[PDB]
Symmetry: D2
Subunit: 287 residues, 4 copies
Amino acid sequence: TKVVLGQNQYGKAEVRLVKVTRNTARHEIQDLNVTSQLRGDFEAAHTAGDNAHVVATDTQKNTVYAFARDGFATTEEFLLRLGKHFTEGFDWVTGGRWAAQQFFWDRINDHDHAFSRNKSEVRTAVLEISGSEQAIVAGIEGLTVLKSTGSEFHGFPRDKYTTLQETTDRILATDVSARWRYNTVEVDFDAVYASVRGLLLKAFAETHSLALQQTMYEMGRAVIETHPEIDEIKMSLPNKHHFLVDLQPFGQDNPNEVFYAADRPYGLIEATIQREGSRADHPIWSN
Amino acid sequence: TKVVLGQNQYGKAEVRLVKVTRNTARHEIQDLNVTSQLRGDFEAAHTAGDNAHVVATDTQKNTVYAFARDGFATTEEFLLRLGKHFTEGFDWVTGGRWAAQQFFWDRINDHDHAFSRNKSEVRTAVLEISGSEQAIVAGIEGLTVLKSTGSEFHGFPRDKYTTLQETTDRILATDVSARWRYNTVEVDFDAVYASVRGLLLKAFAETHSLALQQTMYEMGRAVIETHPEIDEIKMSLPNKHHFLVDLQPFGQDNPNEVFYAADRPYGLIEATIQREGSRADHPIWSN
Amino acid sequence: TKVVLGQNQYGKAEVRLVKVTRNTARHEIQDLNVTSQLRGDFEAAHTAGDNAHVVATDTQKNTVYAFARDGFATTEEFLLRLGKHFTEGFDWVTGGRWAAQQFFWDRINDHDHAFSRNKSEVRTAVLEISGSEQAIVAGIEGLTVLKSTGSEFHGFPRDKYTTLQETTDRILATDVSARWRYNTVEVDFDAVYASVRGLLLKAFAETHSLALQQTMYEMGRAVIETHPEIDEIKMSLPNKHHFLVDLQPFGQDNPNEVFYAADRPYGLIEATIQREGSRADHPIWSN
Amino acid sequence: TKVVLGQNQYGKAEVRLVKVTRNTARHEIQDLNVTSQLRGDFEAAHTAGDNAHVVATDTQKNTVYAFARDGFATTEEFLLRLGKHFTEGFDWVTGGRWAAQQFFWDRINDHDHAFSRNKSEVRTAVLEISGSEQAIVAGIEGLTVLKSTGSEFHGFPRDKYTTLQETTDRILATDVSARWRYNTVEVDFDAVYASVRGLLLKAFAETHSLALQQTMYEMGRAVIETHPEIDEIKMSLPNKHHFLVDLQPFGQDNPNEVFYAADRPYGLIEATIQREGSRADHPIWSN
């Protein structure tokens, strides 16, 4: 009967930007995948098709490139500038979501202007503005890790659908996906990102795993305990199964040496590790 | 300071199931990609590696195949059975999230047991249980549509970064990604999915678009006005740009005939259309 | 010691073109992904960086759009125009390879200018010119098919590494990747493509398969025997494994009903079916 | 006319294998994606569905895992063992094609059994056996490189469809896909792969490029000139366009700093650099 326009947002998604810093002969590369979406009073645009309040997505795109010309210290700093510009430059725009993926490059044999892509991980940043408030979530993804031993899984319930054998020695492989929310905008973004990455890797490798859940808990704990500016960290870790192949039919044995790496299905362990007292339902996690 | 385990869930993701119904010579095929995740008291699993409460993801996987043996009328019904099983079968499991993608097959020349995949759209379903509360969201994705005319965009704000020219005739192309939440479990799930799909396609095609936001609004309005069992529908529609190629440098005109279909960037318009007075932010959307 | 420049080609790959025919209210859509590469004397370009002979890839791209303006009856006709243009327009260009993928669209409820994408298959065309001679290869890909029964596999040899159990009833699922070479350019391209597509599906579905190899042979035979204009057809068929799940651990039998559809690994059966007396190694297959 | 069975091969594709070396506490990891296909007399299998000569694809897969148990020095040596086994183990199998992708892993903080994936490149190997002849092609793929300056493109012909402007400063970015054929199987495979990788990177970075064709020629020449065991190297290099964004409409200049990294289309430059007098068209290139 009666229909109502609810939450909404629009903008330009995946604007691929490469910013080269070449004031000196020692070039620097900043490679980003930027997305910009605005929130505010767009009622008439939906109900009547009145574009008076619709800042064209093409315009949002042009702004990204225009702002990049001035350069930026970090990805987060760049998103902060974009968000401030759109929310303050238009009265009907009250907020939005600006996100970016940052791709890393390494110099080829330390060359001044020749690089190769480091595809082992992708850094992420998301800025959300709501009226007078803003929040930033940084993250990492695509970082595949594996422990060839020092992992076990036993003591789990055994119902009539359980066939999994308990083990005290198995491979533990996953793709590290983690996102953490800052409780302040005054952060050394690059330094914290590198720190967190190292803490996650260290926790994963040095923790004698009794369950992926425990390893993940330890990874999140290390971060919260080391960084006061981080209120919570969410992780989504797939258990990429490496099956110990049965070689007995061929007259052999397999002392935890030969594995079949299955694509699907895979276990998916996810959790939020937070600082006691901090909020547990922040809007930035809604996307 | 004090680290605490927040929201969490775990299970088996992407269990590929193909159920063949062959009681008669007229075979039927059900093809699904199922994910099962449990929620409850998993504190000890995370903080101490105590797996007493950890129903193995492998066991969750086994359950999917064992349950499929009995057959299921619809994907939603199948998910409902799985959800009830895990929540009621284990005291420390108070809820969860069970999802699936349904892939369509068509018979080859009406053959009894020979089929070809219809890859033009993927059907989705998600069930979330939280205590005594149950919620189901159905959806459709991967459905690409295009209008060669009957689409315009003008009257938008023009700032120093605006270069886009107004138009009264352009191509409008998008990939229909839609998800709607049911307000009851007693629904003819297959019949409603077929209906919603048709309403979305019909609205996209018949609406003289003055903006993608408007087309989306009309699509959502049609679904809500037609189905009493739906409280809201969310849509994420990319504006896949088809640029009219400038052939004037070659002395040729281009009367809206030759286009370059760019990959990225793309406009991304999203909105929620809801039944007036219905829940504003149902937890199921958080995931 | 002495280095020589061997075979080489260059051009613009993946030019996405959408040609809308709108001389009447009944719009038509042609959607292509075009690749153009030239062959000839480019010795100096490689050894000295002298670009006098290098028709820019950007120019080749512009040519694709400029030619699309005039329209084209078929993808093959369009490729033929491009090939002729480049080979005859530049003395140092003696040939090349022009390819295209054609994507299909269906009208939305028979609407005059609103369509939805048919993603169930992709049509391909490849034109290769070498001096005064030219050859065309047409094909289809991405067409997934499945037989729920009427397939068996037994009688294979057994060695110490063999564990496979014979069967007289199994699922036979594959992705139809087929390419055929015409022995003349005077062909009703759209009609033959449609016919070939039909012959492949018919042979796949109606052949009681004793092996994927046998099914494939029958598919190729049907095509060669039906179309005089075709000298050979090459197919690459993966055997997409659908494992009958063992439910006995749960107290249930599985009468060929519940299957696990594994991603990898997969059997890969490939063969060339030819018209007796035709060429055995046409250069167009080298690419 | 009569239908004939032409070239054909079959086997198991993409068998994912992970081999852990753990005789000492210092674990090593070998990660491969293996494909096995046999060639020989399979006439009856295709024409009559007689599987007497059909060594099961499942058996081939089992053989990969069984052989993995004994360990292997390099990926190429592993393929050689497999190839010799099938060709020498079955009289009707006269040869085949065995290939693999090798994925790299780095230790986490020099840990004994904890690693992370290096996804910046993928190493490939292809072995083809034809009777007594063993031909091997090694390669590298997925290695993206970029030069921020030291690249120009001018002096090309300006035909009636040429709009590209000459330039003496542009970005040159590509994905290094290279494959080289050894003229002997007695090679230090790991050492040569490392050397070749370094030579390609070096030539790409240090060559003042006047054309991608020139940069490619120099990359290939460096390889052939350095390795006597290599008869030819083939490269397929995309010219991933980084368009210098025009900011003048916004009142700004853009001194080679802000770029739009387009997805498609892209220039595709390919060539074969061979040792003078070597085989012109080795069958292994046909696949």
